[PDB]
Structures are given as structure tokens and as C-alpha cells.
């Protein structure tokens, strides 16, 4: 068991490119067999926000 929190919180929010850079730096290249995403979205957000997400 290993968490993905390198004590920095815009590496946690998946509306940020630093999240992508951090997680794809940690996780090995194409080795996850089961990805899951239990994310919520606030109602009526920005379209570009949803694009980035």
C-alpha cells in the first residue's frame, strides 16, 4: 500500500497539470491494470475546467 501525497496539494487536485506530472512520474509506465476515478464535479462549472479535467 502506497499513497500519492508528496506533501503538496496541487499535485492532488486533478484539475492541474502538476497532478499529471506527479502521478505519471510516480507510477510505472503502462502498468496499472485497474484504474478507478470516483471524482465529483460541482454543478455548472467552467467548460474549460471540464476540458482540463
Amino acid at each position: 500500500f502506497r499513497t500519492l501525497w508528496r506533501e503538496n496539494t496541487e499535485e492532488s487536485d486533478l484539475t492541474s497539470d502538476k497532478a499529471v506530472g506527479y502521478i505519471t512520474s510516480v507510477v510505472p509506465y503502462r502498468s496499472v491494470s485497474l484504474l478507478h476515478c470516483d471524482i465529483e464535479i460541482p454543478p455548472g462549472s467552467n467548460q474549460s475546467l471540464l476540458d482540463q479535467l
Binding site: 508528496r6 506533501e7 503538496n8 496539494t9 496541487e10 499535485e11 502538476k18 506527479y22
Partner: protein, 526 residues
């Protein structure tokens, strides 16, 4: 030596070589504390990857966190909470309410007991050092050796002592910073060093924001790592001996009130002190087993929990931790709940709380919506991850009602643990068992505590004879009359006093710290 050794090796070499004519080759020691800058290596994490120290096999650090978007103006509606920051605790010096105590000791007596405790701490505990300590303490007061052997406090730190108004800094961003310290194991003690690290971290945090800045914009974490230092010393072993030579004469007058206390101890001290001399012959605590010492810490860290918080403006956060006392015990919260029950048996009786399943519900009333909200001692205790894991294993804490961070700041989970331990103690007392009621300060109190246990039994075990308004003896007689009109009877019809509860706590805590088998006995209880 050379230029590239850590500074305390150089300073110890300089002291040894400079005092070598006077000393003659021995090592002047007990002196050097490391430099706070040379000790630690720091790392700041703001928007990206973590500390390259802790990425490279480091474990030991302190942790400082400043939040994001903090305004330093008069428009302050988005700020984090502002608390009074860490200023630095000397020892937070208590008044002398010591291991056997007198309320009105003159300062000469304080100096004498300070000298005796420091002398025994440094040079051992035997007849020669107590002879020397008696000889030295005669120069300030007029007590005998039997008073020094018990009135002298336990050796903790007492070599410390030897402006108009100058604040230590501005406090612009340091009232907002979260400090945590729990990832340091060998630099977290009762000690000067982590106080220095906590002050250096706050000064670096405030160093990051110059006076031309009114808004912080990011989150900031310091790791102050202190593990791979060249100034890491192993704690040496103080090997006791006897002071060679005789202590000097040290003449003194009885005229100087400013130099000499002619008669400290009085008759109201005489009686309870020599009764404590008589009862102090059962203080053979080194001969006892380790698990019995853990039992002593169970009743001793316990039975104080429930006396401070049950009695039957500028508020601070000046709270106890109980965080290493429960880290060593084997259930002390049971005795905490028992102390609260024995305190509240009066209002249990006067409301005529009957049966089995009404006492625990009244304790749920008193615990869940206590009109005081300052449960912060246990709320600071059980939030510790080791303690929280132990209580999740055995001790019946509930599962959390949110994410594990934001679970009501643990000020209400402690009430849940109190309810659980309360029903465990009630179910234990109903089922033919008792508990080792080590009740100190030993009569009024003895028949009082037996009346407490009989009152708990009376509301737990027809019409209840109302003993309200009576003196204590008529209450005890009528309760023992009402119970004996029918194991449980063995619990109805029926410990000692080595010393008071604080001495039995601290001495046993330190002796469990002195043991070597403590790890395997810790693993025996998971």
C-alpha cells in the same frame, strides 16, 4: 582535529586542552549542546516535488506548514485560524507541589532540595552522596537526612537558572503556521534542542516574507531534518561513584533570614512526614516486575484523568498531553471512567438512577453534551497515530464519521471512548469483579471511598433507602444494611499507600523507561 569536524568535537577538544593543566587529562563533559544551524538541513516544499532528504532515506524531521492565501491587512475574511504561536517553554515551571510536599517552603528549602536532587542525579544514589548532600543542604536550612531522602524531587532538569519589554519578533505569519514534531524520535524529549528547532523554523517561515509583502500566495512546508548530522552524539552513560574527599565545613549563621532557614518543618508536617517515612519502606519498585509497573501506570496515568476534568477572560491552549504515559501502559481509560463514576455517584443517587441500562445512558448524557467543552487533553492524546491505532485495536473506539483528518477535531471522539470504557467498567463490576483501588493520601477518606463504591452498588443493585442529608457514618450503615438483606456480596463487603499518585506515576514511568524487556512486552499486547 581539523577544520572539517562538527563544532562540538572542536569545542570539547578546546575545553579539554585548555583545562588540561588544572584537570589533568579528564574529560570536561555534560556541557556542549549543538549549534542549531549546523545541526539541521532544511527543505521547503511549495508547489512541486518533495524533500530530497526524505527521498534519500531520511526519516527524522520537524514539519512546519503555512497555508495559502493569507492576507496581512484589515480585510481578513478568508484567513486560517489565528492562534498564539510558539514562544518557547523554559520548563513551564510549576510551583513546588512535589513528590512529598509542603505548601509554604521557604526559598532556602527549595535551594536545598534542588542541590540534593542535582547531586544525586549527577553522582549516584548511595550513602556517601547522601552524606555530602546533607552536608551541603545544612548551609541553607535545618532539616535531617530523612527529610532529604523524600522531600527531594525526582531528577528531571533542574540545572537551568544561572529587561523592560522587547518582543522576540514581529508575529506576522507565525500565528498561522502549523507545527508538528512527531517524526522526531531521538530529538523529542520532556529538552532544549527541539525548542531551538521549533523557534528556528518559525523564524525561517517569517524570513520568507519580507515587509513589502501583504499576501502569501502558496502553501509552504518546512522539513527541518536532523538525522544525518555530523553533530549527532550518542547519549553517554552516567556511571555512579562516590565523591572522594569530604565536603567542606561551610559555616553559617542562624541570624541571616536571607541566608538560612532555622526551622522549615512543622508539627503538621511532622505527623504526615514521619507517617510517610513509616510507609516508605514498601518503595522497592525496582524489585517489581515490568507488567506490575504497567499496572501502576494504568492506575496512575488513570485516576488523574477524571479528577482534573470532574470537580464533583483570556483562554489559552495550555494543556497536558498524556501522550507518552499512555504510550507505555493495561487499560488506564478504564480507571479514568471509574474515577468519573465514583465522582458522579452522588448525582447518580439523587436522581435515583436505577437498573443496569440507565447509569450508562446518564453517562452518555454527561459525556456527549458535557456543559464544559475542554476535553482537549485526551483530544490531544488520542489523535496521536500510535495511540489511535492501539485504541482501534483494543479499547473500543468507534469508526470515524468523516474523513480521518476532520473527525470533529477528536474533542468528541474522546467522549465516545469515555462511554465505552464506562460501560466496560460497569459490566466488570456487575460480573463479580473489582479493581485494584490504589487510593492515595492515607479515617474520613476511607469510609468516604467505601461509601462511593456502595453508592455505585446501591444505584446498580424494592425501594432505595434515601440516605440524603445524613452524615457519612449513617449513610454507610444504611447502605450496608440495605445491600446485605439478600461474588457480588464479596464485592459489596470489601489498595495501599506507598506514596502519592504523582510519585507512583512518575517513578513507575521512569522505571518502565529504564527497562530493556519493554519492547517484547509491548509486542505481547500486540
Amino acid at each position: 582535529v581539523s577544520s572539517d569536524m562538527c563544532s562540538l568535537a572542536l569545542a570539547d577538544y578546546a575545553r579539554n586542552r585548555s583545562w588540561s593543566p588544572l584537570t589533568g587529562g579528564r574529560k570536561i563533559l555534560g556541557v556542549s549542546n549543538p549549534d542549531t544551524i549546523e545541526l539541521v538541513e532544511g527543505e521547503i516544499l511549495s508547489i512541486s516535488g518533495g524533500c530530497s532528504k526524505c527521498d534519500s532515506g531520511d526519516e527524522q524531521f520537524t514539519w512546519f506548514h503555512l497555508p495559502s492565501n493569507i492576507e496581512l491587512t484589515d480585510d481578513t475574511s478568508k484567513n486560517p485560524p489565528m492562534r498564539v504561536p510558539y514562544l518557547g517553554s523554559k520548563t513551564q515551571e510549576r510551583r513546588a507541589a512535589s513528590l512529598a510536599k509542603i505548601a509554604h517552603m521557604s526559598p532556602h528549602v527549595k535551594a536545598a532540595l534542588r542541590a540534593s536532587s542535582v547531586l544525586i542525579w549527577a553522582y549516584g544514589d548511595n550513602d556517601i552522596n547522601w552524606t555530602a548532600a546533607l552536608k551541603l543542604a545544612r548551609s541553607r536550612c535545618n532539616i535531617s537526612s530523612e527529610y532529604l531522602r523524600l522531600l527531594s524531587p525526582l531528577p528531571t532538569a533542574g540545572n537551568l537558572q544561572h529587561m523592560t519589554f522587547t518582543p522576540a519578533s514581529l508575529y506576522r505569519v507565525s500565528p498561522y503556521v502549523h507545527i508538528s514534531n512527531d517524526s522526531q524520535r531521538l530529538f523529542t524529549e520532556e529538552n532544549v534542542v527541539y525548542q531551538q528547532i521549533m523557534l528556528l523554523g518559525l523564524s525561517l517561515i517569517e524570513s520568507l516574507f519580507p515587509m513589502t509583502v501583504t499576501k502569501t500566495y502558496d502553501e509552504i512546508t518546512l522539513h527541518l531534518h536532523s538525522k544525518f548530522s555530523c553533530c549527532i552524539r550518542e547519549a553517554p552513560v552516567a556511571v555512579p561513584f562516590e565523591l572522594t574527599g569530604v565536603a567542606p565545613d561551610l559555616r553559617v549563621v542562624a541570624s541571616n533570614k536571607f541566608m538560612y532557614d532555622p526551622n522549615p518543618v512543622a508539627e503538621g508536617d511532622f505527623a504526615r512526614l514521619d507517617l510517610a517515612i513509616f510507609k516508605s519502606y514498601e518503595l522497592n519498585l525496582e524489585s517489581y516486575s515490568t507488567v506490575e509497573l504497567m499496572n501502576i501506570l494504568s492506575i496512575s496515568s488513570g485516576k488523574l484523568i477524571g479528577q482534573s476534568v470532574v470537580s464533583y477572560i483570556i483562554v489559552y491552549d495550555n494543556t497536558r498531553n498524556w501522550i507518552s504515559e499512555a504510550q507505555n501502559s493495561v487499560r488506564l481509560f478504564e480507571y479514568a471512567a471509574l474515577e468519573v463514576l465514583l465522582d458522579c455517584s452522588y448525582q447518580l443517587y439523587y436522581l435515583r438512577v436505577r437498573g443496569l441500562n440507565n447509569v450508562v445512558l446518564y453517562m452518555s448524557d454527561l459525556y456527549k453534551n458535557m456543559p464544559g467543552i475542554l476535553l482537549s487533553n485526551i483530544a490531544a492524546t488520542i489523535s496521536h497515530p500510535i495511540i489511535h491505532s492501539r485504541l482501534h485495536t483494543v479499547g473500543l473506539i468507534s469508526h470515524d464519521g468523516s474523513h480521518q483528518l476532520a473527525d470533529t477535531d477528536f474533542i468528541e471522539l474522546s467522549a465516545k471512548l469515555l462511554v465505552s470504557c464506562t460501560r466496560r467498567v460497569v459490566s466488570g463490576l456487575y460480573a463479580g469483579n473489582k479493581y485494584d483501588l490504589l487510593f492515595p493520601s492515607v479515617n474520613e477518606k476511607m469510609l468516604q471511598l467505601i461509601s462511593r463504591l456502595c453508592c455505585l452498588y446501591t444505584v446498580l443493585f424494592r425501594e432505595i433507602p434515601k440516605i440524603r442529608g445524613l452524615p457519612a457514618e449513617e449513610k454507610c450503615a444504611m447502605l450496608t444494611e440495605y445491600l446485605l438483606s439478600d461474588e457480588q456480596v464479596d464485592s459489596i463487603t470489601s489498595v495501599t499507600f506507598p506514596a502519592n499518585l504523582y510519585y507512583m506515576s512518575r517513578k513507575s514511568l521512569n522505571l518502565i523507561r529504564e527497562r530493556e524487556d519493554r519492547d517484547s512486552i509491548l509486542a505481547l499486547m500486540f
